Design an enzyme around this catalytic site. Structure first.
Site, PDB file in Angstrom:
ATOM      1  N   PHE B  84      29.498 -19.231  62.086  1.00 28.92           N
ATOM      2  CA  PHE B  84      29.301 -19.472  60.648  1.00 28.92           C
ATOM      3  C   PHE B  84      30.659 -19.293  60.011  1.00 28.92           C
ATOM      4  O   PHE B  84      31.395 -18.406  60.439  1.00 28.92           O
ATOM      5  CB  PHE B  84      28.251 -18.530  60.025  1.00 28.92           C
ATOM      6  CG  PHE B  84      27.962 -18.868  58.576  1.00 28.92           C
ATOM      7  CD1 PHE B  84      27.299 -20.029  58.266  1.00 28.92           C
ATOM      8  CD2 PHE B  84      28.385 -17.999  57.543  1.00 28.92           C
ATOM      9  CE1 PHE B  84      27.003 -20.412  56.943  1.00 28.92           C
ATOM     10  CE2 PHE B  84      28.095 -18.378  56.221  1.00 28.92           C
ATOM     11  CZ  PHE B  84      27.423 -19.551  55.939  1.00 28.92           C
ATOM     12  N   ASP B 155      31.268  -9.243  65.170  1.00 27.79           N
ATOM     13  CA  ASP B 155      30.514  -9.848  64.040  1.00 27.79           C
ATOM     14  C   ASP B 155      29.102  -9.877  64.550  1.00 27.79           C
ATOM     15  O   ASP B 155      28.595 -10.838  65.123  1.00 27.79           O
ATOM     16  CB  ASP B 155      30.987 -11.148  63.458  1.00 27.79           C
ATOM     17  CG  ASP B 155      30.029 -11.753  62.422  1.00 27.79           C
ATOM     18  OD1 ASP B 155      28.966 -11.193  62.024  1.00 27.79           O
ATOM     19  OD2 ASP B 155      30.398 -12.872  62.033  1.00 27.79           O
TER      20      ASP B 155
HETATM   21  C1  LIG Z   1      27.820 -15.225  62.482  1.00 33.41           C
HETATM   22  C2  LIG Z   1      27.663 -14.883  60.959  1.00 33.41           C
HETATM   23  N1  LIG Z   1      28.684 -14.029  60.415  1.00 33.41           N
HETATM   24  C3  LIG Z   1      28.679 -13.626  59.073  1.00 33.41           C
HETATM   25  C4  LIG Z   1      27.773 -14.246  58.173  1.00 33.41           C
HETATM   26  C5  LIG Z   1      27.823 -13.817  56.677  1.00 33.41           C
HETATM   27  O1  LIG Z   1      26.670 -13.219  56.089  1.00 33.41           O
HETATM   28  P1  LIG Z   1      26.213 -13.353  54.537  1.00 33.41           P
HETATM   29  O2  LIG Z   1      25.589 -14.588  54.375  1.00 33.41           O
HETATM   30  O3  LIG Z   1      25.407 -12.077  54.479  1.00 33.41           O
HETATM   31  O4  LIG Z   1      27.592 -13.173  53.804  1.00 33.41           O
HETATM   32  C6  LIG Z   1      26.674 -15.103  58.625  1.00 33.41           C
HETATM   33  C7  LIG Z   1      25.643 -15.625  57.657  1.00 33.41           C
HETATM   34  N2  LIG Z   1      24.785 -16.687  58.294  1.00 33.41           N
HETATM   35  C8  LIG Z   1      24.218 -17.745  57.524  1.00 33.41           C
HETATM   36  C9  LIG Z   1      24.193 -17.510  56.151  1.00 33.41           C
HETATM   37  C10 LIG Z   1      23.666 -18.594  55.263  1.00 33.41           C
HETATM   38  C11 LIG Z   1      23.162 -19.764  55.756  1.00 33.41           C
HETATM   39  C12 LIG Z   1      23.213 -19.982  57.234  1.00 33.41           C
HETATM   40  C13 LIG Z   1      22.707 -21.219  57.856  1.00 33.41           C
HETATM   41  O5  LIG Z   1      22.810 -21.255  59.257  1.00 33.41           O
HETATM   42  O6  LIG Z   1      22.235 -22.194  57.258  1.00 33.41           O
HETATM   43  C14 LIG Z   1      23.711 -19.002  58.037  1.00 33.41           C
HETATM   44  C15 LIG Z   1      26.673 -15.422  60.120  1.00 33.41           C
HETATM   45  O7  LIG Z   1      25.709 -16.191  60.548  1.00 33.41           O
END
Ligand SMILES: Cc1ncc(COP(=O)(O)O)c(CNc2cccc(C(=O)O)c2)c1O
Ligand SMILES: Cc1ncc(COP(=O)(O)O)c(CNc2cccc(C(=O)O)c2)c1O
EC number: 4.2.1.144
Lengths: 384, 384
Positions: B84, B155
């Site tokens: 992400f 992470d």
């Molecule tokens: C590997 C990873 N690292 C950090 C974050 C950050 O987290 P916050 O969102 O709490 O700041 C994430 C977040 N993962 C995530 C967040 C929003 C949407 C999607 C999607 O796959 O559509 C995935 C993640 O998936």
């Protein structure tokens, strides 16, 4: 016994139902619920703004507003030297240089002449703070803004519902930021917002993007467009903010009557000078009830605070001059020395040591309690 | 009709009472309530960590962990190119250079050999991501860590409750970060945490300071010590997180049984390869049910996602290679070109185009629904 003041924060069934409503949407982030979206429109409307962007907190609303106003490495941001550290810390975080400027001796708002002198070819933003709810000189400031071409950013953390020359924070033609931190005039414990005047739709769109990991609201394939961070507000916080919002205007109305009374009572104590007024600021939110005791060292002012707390008052030292915090000197420090900044910030330099504030909940109490409060103050200031 | 899966997020009276309990403390920020403090101890304990620091979101938990691990201008941070955007965006935000490295073809975790090669005198941190709940090779990674002296940062956004060689995320000797974003394995719509292993108390204290505008927990006089931001979590969010936490272990238990079944069903479809396993990762959290369809362009994979959604499945494209987002190139970009990064990231380069995931709520459903799910997939992959 000691006088008693109304609790803060306050809530009732509005908050209760709000949290349930958020909960039972079964989606707790803004992309699946409607609480943040609805709060944004209610908040913007309340401020006369074209758009509002609710965010995690007031410090990030500043970081986001600066960033979309082009703040970065190589730039300078002018801020009042008397203010909460977030005002400069935000520019520091973006890699810019914070240039602290003096404030008025009586209102404690950013001084227009002092900013005119601090302007530079690197200045990207000028940030008035509406100290304790009392707007800064947005006319004089707006004029410097046109002459130099350096846009203004209002740090409106203390000024929810405030008005300058009949105009709402969001009708002044400049972006502004708010805080919903626990002690603010409306709160959900944490929270913030960026409000965008008519004509700033582009910056609003860019701000939305930078606050959501540069992701378009409708992207499904991870086409992240620009740098940024995550400053998204949750639905629970938004629903508590929508109930707080609804009492704001009237709470400010009780405070305006009570400050009239307290200001006068305080101004009657020899040695004591309440924050000054400004009649162009037609609606002062009254975030803090602030007063100076000119000539007091910090230590005497701190000692007087302690005696006031001991007597039952919710009294505090006021902000430290930002050039006197270690934090300020860690990154993006200006080339001047500490005394060089102090020399051109004589009002901050004194208010930093001699200004006391009481929680805005005192300004909700009855008249009897304000009389009892000013007696306590009058006694304690005799011994300070 | 289409199979049906359990809702996400989920709640019940625990959340209801929690929000009331937070509300009726009458203090909504961590300095006046006990919800964030209690959640921190419950979360840390659950992970075997010495300390936990709950924060606004997972992207800021990364920004904070990096910052206390010395990330900044002049440094490089190694991250998986498949992840992400927050994983790199966080280093970018601190002014560092993100150096994307390839991942394993089957688990999709950061590849140890690839990191060994990318190490440099500027490398300040190496950041494994435990992709979809499956830990990365923390042994091989820990070894590169000692040889180079570049500390690791986990992470762990997808790996709440995960285990490597019997050890909890917080017992691996490295700091780790989590997300509580809406789709995560436990959520309050938004939220994050930084967890600190035994021996990292100093960084924990510094992290607390940087997350609260550099202000000591007990300061009254605005002696801001160091730079930072505000990444404080509110009490409402903390109380919902404490109820989510309590179901986590067992939800992961149902997912582990269901993935066993689905992995096999999927691996039976020609063209389809489910995320690989790793027996050293004894407890896979199962944040996503992920599979590749090697040889598919992005457009065919995207088209197949759409057909799966049309058939009633909560299916998505998987992450984009971070070197293929504009965001990545806006600031702190590495001197290489896009093809040069792609040339040394061939697995990311393919998984970026051919990997599909289904929401982890599918892994809570009954066996019948997983059978119906894999039929739908088998049909759709025939036409892709
Ligand atoms: C590997 C990873 N690292 C950090 C974050 C950050 O987290 P916050 O969102 O709490 O700041 C994430 C977040 N993962 C995530 C967040 C929003 C949407 C999607 C999607 O796959 O559509 C995935 C993640 O998936
Ligand atoms: C002028 C001003 N600007 C921005 C901020 C940042 O808001 P957040 O806190 O929402 O990030 C503030 C916050 N003001 C504030 C916050 C916390 C404690 C105290 C205290 O006076 O003891 C004051 C403030 O007072």
């Amino acid at each position: 016994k000691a006088p008693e003041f109304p609790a803060w924060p306050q809530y009732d069934d509005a908050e209760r139902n709000g949290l349930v409503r958020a909960l039972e949407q079964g989606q707790w982030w803004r992309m699946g619920g409607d609480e943040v979206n609805s709060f944004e429109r209610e908040f913007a409307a309340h401020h006369g703004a074209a758009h509002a962007l609710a965010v995690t907190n007031g410090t990030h609303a500043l970081e986001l507003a600066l960033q979309v106003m082009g703040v970065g490495p190589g730039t300078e941001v002018i801020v009042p030297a008397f203010t909460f550290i977030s005002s400069s810390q935000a520019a520091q975080r973006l890699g810019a240089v914070t240039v602290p400027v003096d404030v008025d001796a009586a209102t404690y708002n950013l001084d227009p002449e002092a900013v005119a002198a601090a302007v530079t070819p690197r200045t990207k933003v000028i940030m008035p703070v509406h100290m304790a709810g009392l707007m800064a000189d947005m006319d004089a400031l707006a004029k410097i803004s046109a002459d130099t071409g350096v846009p203004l950013l209002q740090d409106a953390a203390h000024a929810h519902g405030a008005r300058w020359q009949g105009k709402r924070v969001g009708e002044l033609d400049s972006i502004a930021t708010f805080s919903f931190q626990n002690g603010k005039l409306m709160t959900a414990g944490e929270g913030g917002a960026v409000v965008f005047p008519d004509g700033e739709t582009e910056k609003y769109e860019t701000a939305f993007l930078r606050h959501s990991c540069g992701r378009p609201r409708d992207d499904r394939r991870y086409f992240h467009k620009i740098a940024g961070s995550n400053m998204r507000l949750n639905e629970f916080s938004a629903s508590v903010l929508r109930a707080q919002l609804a009492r704001l205007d009237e709470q400010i109305a009780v405070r305006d009557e009570r400050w009239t009374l307290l200001s006068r009572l305080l101004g009657a104590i020899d040695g004591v000078v309440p924050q000054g007024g400004d009649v162009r600021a037609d609606r002062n939110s009254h975030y803090m009830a602030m007063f100076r005791i000119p000539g007091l060292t910090e230590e005497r002012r701190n000692a007087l605070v302690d005696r006031l707390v001991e007597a039952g008052l919710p009294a505090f030292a006021a902000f430290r001059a930002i050039y006197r915090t270690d934090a300020f000197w860690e990154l993006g420090a200006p080339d001047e020395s500490v005394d060089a900044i102090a020399r051109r910030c004589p009002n901050t330099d004194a208010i930093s040591s001699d200004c006391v504030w009481l929680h805005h909940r005192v300004l909700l109490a009855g008249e009897p309690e304000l009389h009892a409060t000013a007696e306590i103050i009058a006694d304690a200031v005799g011994r300070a």
